[PDB]
Structure formats: structure tokens, C-alpha cells
Design a binder for this molecule. Sequence first.
Ligand SMILES: [Mg+2]
Ligand SMILES: [Mg+2]
Ligand SMILES: [Mg+2]
Ligand SMILES: [Mg+2]
Ligand SMILES: [Mg+2]
Ligand SMILES: [Mg+2]
Ligand SMILES: [Mg+2]
Ligand SMILES: [Mg+2]
Ligand SMILES: [Mg+2]
Ligand SMILES: [Mg+2]
Ligand SMILES: [Mg+2]
Ligand SMILES: [Mg+2]
Ligand SMILES: [Mg+2]
Ligand SMILES: [Mg+2]
Ligand SMILES: [Mg+2]
Ligand SMILES: [Mg+2]
Ligand SMILES: [Mg+2]
Ligand SMILES: [Mg+2]
Ligand SMILES: [Mg+2]
Ligand SMILES: [Mg+2]
Ligand SMILES: [Mg+2]
Ligand SMILES: [Mg+2]
Ligand SMILES: [Mg+2]
Ligand SMILES: [Mg+2]
Ligand SMILES: [Mg+2]
Ligand SMILES: [Mg+2]
Ligand SMILES: [Mg+2]
Ligand SMILES: [Mg+2]
Ligand SMILES: [Mg+2]
Ligand SMILES: [Mg+2]
Ligand SMILES: [Mg+2]
Ligand SMILES: [Mg+2]
Ligand SMILES: [Mg+2]
Ligand SMILES: [Mg+2]
Ligand SMILES: [Mg+2]
Ligand SMILES: [Mg+2]
Ligand SMILES: [Mg+2]
Ligand SMILES: [Mg+2]
Ligand SMILES: [Mg+2]
Ligand SMILES: [Mn+2]
Ligand SMILES: [Mn+2]
Ligand SMILES: [Mn+2]
Ligand SMILES: [Mn+2]
Ligand SMILES: [Mn+2]
Ligand SMILES: [Mn+2]
Ligand SMILES: [Mn+2]
Ligand SMILES: [Mn+2]
Ligand SMILES: [Mn+2]
Ligand SMILES: [Mn+2]
Ligand SMILES: [Mn+2]
Ligand SMILES: [Mn+2]
Ligand SMILES: [Mn+2]
Ligand SMILES: [Mn+2]
Ligand SMILES: [Mn+2]
Ligand SMILES: [Mn+2]
Ligand SMILES: [Mn+2]
Ligand SMILES: [Mn+2]
Ligand SMILES: [Mn+2]
Ligand SMILES: [Mn+2]
Ligand SMILES: [Mn+2]
Ligand SMILES: [Mn+2]
Ligand SMILES: [Mn+2]
Ligand SMILES: [Mn+2]
Ligand SMILES: [Mn+2]
Ligand SMILES: [Mn+2]
Ligand SMILES: [Mn+2]
Ligand SMILES: [Mn+2]
Ligand SMILES: [Mn+2]
Ligand SMILES: [Mn+2]
Ligand SMILES: [Mn+2]
Ligand SMILES: [Mn+2]
Ligand SMILES: [Mn+2]
Ligand SMILES: [Mn+2]
Lengths: 44, 112, 44, 119
Amino acid sequence: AVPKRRTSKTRKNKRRTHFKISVPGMTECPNCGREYKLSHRVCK
Amino acid sequence: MEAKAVARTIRIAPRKVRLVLDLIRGKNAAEAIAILKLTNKASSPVIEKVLMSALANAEHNYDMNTDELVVKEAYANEGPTLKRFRPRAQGRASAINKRTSHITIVVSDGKE
Amino acid sequence: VKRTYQPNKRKHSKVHGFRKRMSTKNGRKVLARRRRKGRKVLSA
Amino acid sequence: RKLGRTSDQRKAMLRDLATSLIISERIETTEARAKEVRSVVEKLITLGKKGDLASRRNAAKTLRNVEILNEDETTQTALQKLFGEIAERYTERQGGYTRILKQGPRRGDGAESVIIELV
RNA sequence: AUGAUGAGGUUAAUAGGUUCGAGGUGGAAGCAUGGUGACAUGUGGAGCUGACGAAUACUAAUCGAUCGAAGACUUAAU
RNA sequence: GACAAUGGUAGGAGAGCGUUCUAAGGGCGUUGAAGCAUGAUCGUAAGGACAUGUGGAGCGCUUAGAAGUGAGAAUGCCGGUGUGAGUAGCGAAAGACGGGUGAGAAUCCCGUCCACCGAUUGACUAAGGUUUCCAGAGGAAGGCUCGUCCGCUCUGGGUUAGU
RNA sequence: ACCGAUAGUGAACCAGUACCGUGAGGGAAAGGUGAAAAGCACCCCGGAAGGGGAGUGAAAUAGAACCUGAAACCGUGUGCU
RNA sequence: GAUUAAGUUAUUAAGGGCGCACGGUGGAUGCCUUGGCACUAGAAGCCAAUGAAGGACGUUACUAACGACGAUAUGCUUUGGG
Ligand SMILES: [Mg+2]
Ligand SMILES: [Mg+2]
Ligand SMILES: [Mg+2]
Ligand SMILES: [Mg+2]
Ligand SMILES: [Mg+2]
Ligand SMILES: [Mg+2]
Ligand SMILES: [Mg+2]
Ligand SMILES: [Mg+2]
Ligand SMILES: [Mg+2]
Ligand SMILES: [Mg+2]
Ligand SMILES: [Mg+2]
Ligand SMILES: [Mg+2]
Ligand SMILES: [Mg+2]
Ligand SMILES: [Mg+2]
Ligand SMILES: [Mg+2]
Ligand SMILES: [Mg+2]
Ligand SMILES: [Mg+2]
Ligand SMILES: [Mg+2]
Ligand SMILES: [Mg+2]
Ligand SMILES: [Mg+2]
Ligand SMILES: [Mg+2]
Ligand SMILES: [Mg+2]
Ligand SMILES: [Mg+2]
Ligand SMILES: [Mg+2]
Ligand SMILES: [Mg+2]
Ligand SMILES: [Mg+2]
Ligand SMILES: [Mg+2]
Ligand SMILES: [Mg+2]
Ligand SMILES: [Mg+2]
Ligand SMILES: [Mg+2]
Ligand SMILES: [Mg+2]
Ligand SMILES: [Mg+2]
Ligand SMILES: [Mg+2]
Ligand SMILES: [Mg+2]
Ligand SMILES: [Mg+2]
Ligand SMILES: [Mg+2]
Ligand SMILES: [Mg+2]
Ligand SMILES: [Mg+2]
Ligand SMILES: [Mg+2]
Ligand SMILES: [Mn+2]
Ligand SMILES: [Mn+2]
Ligand SMILES: [Mn+2]
Ligand SMILES: [Mn+2]
Ligand SMILES: [Mn+2]
Ligand SMILES: [Mn+2]
Ligand SMILES: [Mn+2]
Ligand SMILES: [Mn+2]
Ligand SMILES: [Mn+2]
Ligand SMILES: [Mn+2]
Ligand SMILES: [Mn+2]
Ligand SMILES: [Mn+2]
Ligand SMILES: [Mn+2]
Ligand SMILES: [Mn+2]
Ligand SMILES: [Mn+2]
Ligand SMILES: [Mn+2]
Ligand SMILES: [Mn+2]
Ligand SMILES: [Mn+2]
Ligand SMILES: [Mn+2]
Ligand SMILES: [Mn+2]
Ligand SMILES: [Mn+2]
Ligand SMILES: [Mn+2]
Ligand SMILES: [Mn+2]
Ligand SMILES: [Mn+2]
Ligand SMILES: [Mn+2]
Ligand SMILES: [Mn+2]
Ligand SMILES: [Mn+2]
Ligand SMILES: [Mn+2]
Ligand SMILES: [Mn+2]
Ligand SMILES: [Mn+2]
Ligand SMILES: [Mn+2]
Ligand SMILES: [Mn+2]
Ligand SMILES: [Mn+2]
Ligand SMILES: [Mn+2]
């Protein structure tokens, strides 16, 4: 089984509308000026 | 005025770089710096280095207020693609694209 | 599976080297053709 | 109960990890192995708190064969470390001799990373 | 499968540990005894015990961020 | 000014458009040629100008001459670049942690433990290969990931026979 | 009234060469910065690669993968939808 | 009360489409010529045991490759040119 006709620019783009890393959960870090993942450790 | 820096011919595929870049775009410089630091994709350190350099020559070369900046724009473009191949069964070999990307970043402020 | 071509310096030299070439009129014709062509390498 | 690999490998792996955590008294690993190990290490510590020779041999059943574990000058083997300063340290404690701290993602495999220490 | 669904997230029993249990196994180790011994008996339904039941904040569910209303027009009726 | 005729495949006939070169004539051009790009311009067609941008040398017009004179199709040839798709694959197998190094470490070094082969995954050598051996550097590319490492890169150096 | 880099020799470039075959044999691709190397001192981010200034230059929106730089194809912004 | 009732309409764009703007890849197009191609006219038509054709290996201060040259080696003598 192989594609019978080629995907259009536009088809392939509608296909990828869900294909994206989303913004990480992040929070105001140790009062050390850092920035860290939610629920993950401050680091020195 | 509002400043720019480019990382030309990086060995990451543009389809991949664009993923992080889309997170970064239009964000304030601090947020974007963070998101770059905490994002788990491979492009992140690279785009980190580039937003950083763009900010640096934004300060030294235009005496810009490094706090008030925004990521005016950011994007990757197709670079030259080094072409390799892997051997396959029955002696045939198949094409492989080691793609590269021109990452570009532009910090800004009060436009006029 | 053993392939065709199991190398042998002693045997590759024969049937293919300058001497074995020149040993007959036809090798003369060969080296003629190759020198005429301009090979960096004539026989073995 | 969780899995990384084969039941025997998983056994050896957890043994190595617990024995190791008793030696160097905090370690870094995947969140998964951390969450599995905390069970085992805590159970070894309770055997140690018990003190009877039965439970010492039971401890020996799982714990890895050796350490230098010397500190100031020679001595304590893991097991002995377990029934020694370790056990005495926690005798007044309720449960939970272990905490898991989240490092966040590792580089090459993008594994979640965590530190597991013992207080 | 993933996501989705549901139980919870300190004013907390959501999982781990801890203490009891249920069920499963069948009599731990050490010792004492009887044997020339292999072994047997006692201590003692012993010891061990994933997922099943309870109790307990001892470890971890931290701080935090984002999303989300101010209600169009006409006509009839109060 | 009338009045007729003007669908069309194989095919016959006719008039023309454009490309290259030549000849003669006459012209444009660093105050910016060709080419390229855009435009809402012109002729009945093939097609022709004009303006702005780019570009930084060469070009048109007229009459005639001659042709490697016009492409969308040959599972045509070459080059590039898509689709498939972030899909398949990543080549039999046990690793875990501590300590180093480093810009960066699942992957390098050291250590401890664990594991695998053990008529062999050990040892020595014939063919064949022909510097891959060594040491100190290195990390673009090769390595199916990563790389500080390498049978990769640079620099230097290594094979000693009367029996 | 021959070619002008898929053309003209296979070969405008150290071609009968990379490469391919036991061998006879087969047999490529690859021309162009600028007038002048004046080939970007110096400062800035970065380990580097790369890049922003500052400069050379008529021009580097001529920067070495360098004249022009079409199309396929890939991206950012959006007016109408 | 915009309350009640009936009816009619809009905004949304996760993403897509057309138009445009700015880029990237790529190397067509133009311009160019170091090389070819087909002929003209004239020289020339053989070299070798006095060891050729073509090679191999060497020679430069540093030397991998081509060319030159050869243990007198990136050249020596000699006569003329310059
Ligand atoms: Mg896409
Ligand atoms: Mg492809
Ligand atoms: Mg030889
Ligand atoms: Mg797996
Ligand atoms: Mg228990
Ligand atoms: Mg405690
Ligand atoms: Mg619900
Ligand atoms: Mg309570
Ligand atoms: Mg007795
Ligand atoms: Mg004109
Ligand atoms: Mg036009
Ligand atoms: Mg357009
Ligand atoms: Mg014309
Ligand atoms: Mg004309
Ligand atoms: Mg004519
Ligand atoms: Mg075709
Ligand atoms: Mg996926
Ligand atoms: Mg699929
Ligand atoms: Mg080291
Ligand atoms: Mg080193
Ligand atoms: Mg360090
Ligand atoms: Mg063997
Ligand atoms: Mg082997
Ligand atoms: Mg290093
Ligand atoms: Mg090395
Ligand atoms: Mg080896
Ligand atoms: Mg050619
Ligand atoms: Mg053959
Ligand atoms: Mg400049
Ligand atoms: Mg430049
Ligand atoms: Mg190019
Ligand atoms: Mg384009
Ligand atoms: Mg819109
Ligand atoms: Mg869009
Ligand atoms: Mg209504
Ligand atoms: Mg969107
Ligand atoms: Mg003649
Ligand atoms: Mg003779
Ligand atoms: Mg000769
Ligand atoms: Mn998209
Ligand atoms: Mn094969
Ligand atoms: Mn087994
Ligand atoms: Mn909260
Ligand atoms: Mn109405
Ligand atoms: Mn007709
Ligand atoms: Mn008619
Ligand atoms: Mn005709
Ligand atoms: Mn022309
Ligand atoms: Mn123009
Ligand atoms: Mn003109
Ligand atoms: Mn004509
Ligand atoms: Mn033609
Ligand atoms: Mn994947
Ligand atoms: Mn699948
Ligand atoms: Mn897979
Ligand atoms: Mn493998
Ligand atoms: Mn090791
Ligand atoms: Mn074994
Ligand atoms: Mn055997
Ligand atoms: Mn071997
Ligand atoms: Mn040999
Ligand atoms: Mn080596
Ligand atoms: Mn790699
Ligand atoms: Mn001797
Ligand atoms: Mn060309
Ligand atoms: Mn060969
Ligand atoms: Mn030049
Ligand atoms: Mn620096
Ligand atoms: Mn530089
Ligand atoms: Mn200048
Ligand atoms: Mn030019
Ligand atoms: Mn160019
Ligand atoms: Mn003779």
C-alpha cells in the first residue's frame, strides 16, 4: 500500500495543525533569579 | 535600532527548529529566554545562544534597554543539505537528507 | 556464503601482470590499447 | 510494581541501586527507578532497625555483596552500614526514609531525572 | 495506546513507607535435645509474604502559572 | 457602400510571429546593456512596447541572407526539489551507581558491584588487507543517537635476525 | 553566416583521472570575488561554527559554498475570506 | 431588568484559501573564455641493441601532487640572443 496521489501543500498542512510542542509549565524559580519546571527542583 | 542575529548553516532540520521557534516568537526577552532553557527539544540550546547573541549586540551596538525588548521575529530557513545514504537489503541504497537551517532572531523595542 | 573473488597475490600476478601480459601477442595488443588510452596503470 | 527490563535484571538492578544508595547516601537516576527503589531501600532500613540475626540474613539476601564504605578509616560493609549508623539514625522515625527530588529532563535520551536521598 | 475518564493534591489518606490484618505458604533462623549419622523433635499454626482491608502524615502530591462573564437586533406582551 | 462565405480529424494550400548567427544601413548604452522581477499596456493570433526595481556590461531597430529556429507528454537523459512523514528503520545481548574531565556527558576516563563467552567472544599464526599499530593534540565531516571518544582529523614516531 | 560550461573533445578544472570490474574493459562530475587581496584591524555574543558593529570597496543586499541569481520547493507578516 | 415570548442576525479561526510584502534553497537565464571543433598554406613523415615507445624510482631549504631534471638530478658546459 503506497499513496495513490500526492498530498497537497494544503492537505499536509491541515494534517499538521496538532503537531507542536506546547509551552512548558514553568514557575518563578528559587528567589535566586532562575526559572524552573513546575514541581521540579530549584538548583543552587 | 531594533536588533538581529543569525546562526547560519546549523546541522538541525528546519522542520525541527521551527518547533521551538514557534514557542519563542513574539515573547518578551525574559520569557523567551526561559522557555528556551526549559524546553526539552535539541534546538533549544542553539536558539538560546542566538537570542542571547542578538540581545548582546542589541545592547553594545545600539545601547538598548535590555529589559524592555521583545522577540520581534524569529524563524528558520532551509540551508544547504548534505546528502548521505544508507545501504539497504538486496544491495540497493537509499537517500538521506542531513538538513541544515539558517536560524534568525530579531529583538526589538519601541519601534519609533 | 563465500563470494566470488578470493584474492591471491601469487595468482593475481599471473594472467594479469606485465610479464604474463607480454608473454603473448595479445597482451602486447592489450598494453598497446591501454598505453594508447593512457592508463595510469597498465597491468597488475 | 514497575518494570525496566527482565525480572532477574530488574532484581539485580534494584539490588545494585539500593546497595549503592546506602553507600553514597544520595544518588541520581530516572524517576521510575527512583519510585521503585524507595520501596526496597526503605524495607532494608526496617530490617536494619529490627536488629535480629534473622533479619540481618534477610537483609543480606538482597543487598549487594560489598563496599569499602570506609569514611574516616576502613571498616563498615554495606549491610553493616545498614545495621550500623543507618539503622541507629532512624530508630525513632515513623516510616519513609527516602525522598525523591526532580531534576527534570536528561540530555541524550530526554529521560526525566531525579535525585533520591535518605532523610 | 496517547490523550480522554475517575480518586486526590495539606483545611490532605492520592500513591510509597510504617503498624495491624485478610488470604497464600506450611513449621523460618538461632538454639536445645535424640541419634554413629543422613536426619527427627521441641521452642512455635513458626517464619516469610506482589497487587486485597484498615489505621498512621513518616517521604512525596511545594511555591506557582495559564484559561474563563459584563450578555446584538426586531416585533408582541407586562 | 451592397450582397454572399467563414464547425471540422488524416490531410493539401496560404499568410505570418518569434529565436541564433551574417551582411549592409542607421541607432542606444556606466547619465547605466543583456538577463531577471513586478505592473491595471498594445495587436485578430503567434506576440510587441512602456514604467519602476535588480543588475553592471553589452545591446536593438530596418532590409535581406542562413539555420544545431520554437517542447508538456517518448515507463525519454541530467540536475534540483517535493509527496509519502516526523512515518519505517537505528543490524541478535545486562547493566547500575559513585568519582573525574569538559562549553556541553545515558554514551569519554577511573572505581566498585552485577552480568556474558569460556573446543571460546581466550591464545598464536596462514591467506588477504597495507599504516588501520603508538603518543599528544582535535571534533566540521565519517560513527545509524550522543560524543570530551574513535579503525575519523592534525602533528610527531614506531617493524632491529649468520642460526 | 562552428561551440560557448547538459554546449564544444570523454576531459576549458593537474581525465582515461574519482569511481566500477578477476580481467579485457567501462568511465564521470567539477569554469567565473574584485580593477586591485585592498580577503573585513578592532570591539561585542559564542568552545567553536556563525553573526552585529566598525572598516576595505563603485558595489560585499561583490565575503570566499563569492557575477547575474529564474522555477520547483521552504518559511515570516498579513488585506479580503 | 433588554423582563417574558417569538423571530432574525453577528462576532470566533484551531487551522485553511486567495492576494501581497520580505526572505531561504536552488543554479536556470544573460554576459564571459582559459578549451574544443572543421579546415586552409607550408615544414615534417619515422624511432630501436650507440638499448626506443612508455614507464617505475629518485632530485627541490621546507615537498603531497603535476612539469622539468635525472645520482653532475627543480640541472652542468658551451657558444649566439637578451
Ligand atoms: Mg508543517
Ligand atoms: Mg525525501
Ligand atoms: Mg610491482
Ligand atoms: Mg523499550
Ligand atoms: Mg513488609
Ligand atoms: Mg524520618
Ligand atoms: Mg468531566
Ligand atoms: Mg485522620
Ligand atoms: Mg548427638
Ligand atoms: Mg531600451
Ligand atoms: Mg512582463
Ligand atoms: Mg508573485
Ligand atoms: Mg529581441
Ligand atoms: Mg531581428
Ligand atoms: Mg531570413
Ligand atoms: Mg519527461
Ligand atoms: Mg510522533
Ligand atoms: Mg503512516
Ligand atoms: Mg579524564
Ligand atoms: Mg584529554
Ligand atoms: Mg567541572
Ligand atoms: Mg576464537
Ligand atoms: Mg566478535
Ligand atoms: Mg575537550
Ligand atoms: Mg582523541
Ligand atoms: Mg582495534
Ligand atoms: Mg563537458
Ligand atoms: Mg565481472
Ligand atoms: Mg558592514
Ligand atoms: Mg557580510
Ligand atoms: Mg550556491
Ligand atoms: Mg524564489
Ligand atoms: Mg485575520
Ligand atoms: Mg497564514
Ligand atoms: Mg430567544
Ligand atoms: Mg495559529
Ligand atoms: Mg598540410
Ligand atoms: Mg638500430
Ligand atoms: Mg622515455
Ligand atoms: Mn502549521
Ligand atoms: Mn550485499
Ligand atoms: Mn535466570
Ligand atoms: Mn496553587
Ligand atoms: Mn428582524
Ligand atoms: Mn474553417
Ligand atoms: Mn458555419
Ligand atoms: Mn503544407
Ligand atoms: Mn545574445
Ligand atoms: Mn529595465
Ligand atoms: Mn534600442
Ligand atoms: Mn529576417
Ligand atoms: Mn531544436
Ligand atoms: Mn521518535
Ligand atoms: Mn505507527
Ligand atoms: Mn519506532
Ligand atoms: Mn546495535
Ligand atoms: Mn566501567
Ligand atoms: Mn556464565
Ligand atoms: Mn561446550
Ligand atoms: Mn578472537
Ligand atoms: Mn600478508
Ligand atoms: Mn589508536
Ligand atoms: Mn553523530
Ligand atoms: Mn645474535
Ligand atoms: Mn552557466
Ligand atoms: Mn578495484
Ligand atoms: Mn579574476
Ligand atoms: Mn568570549
Ligand atoms: Mn569570526
Ligand atoms: Mn566604503
Ligand atoms: Mn563582472
Ligand atoms: Mn551570487
Ligand atoms: Mn643492431
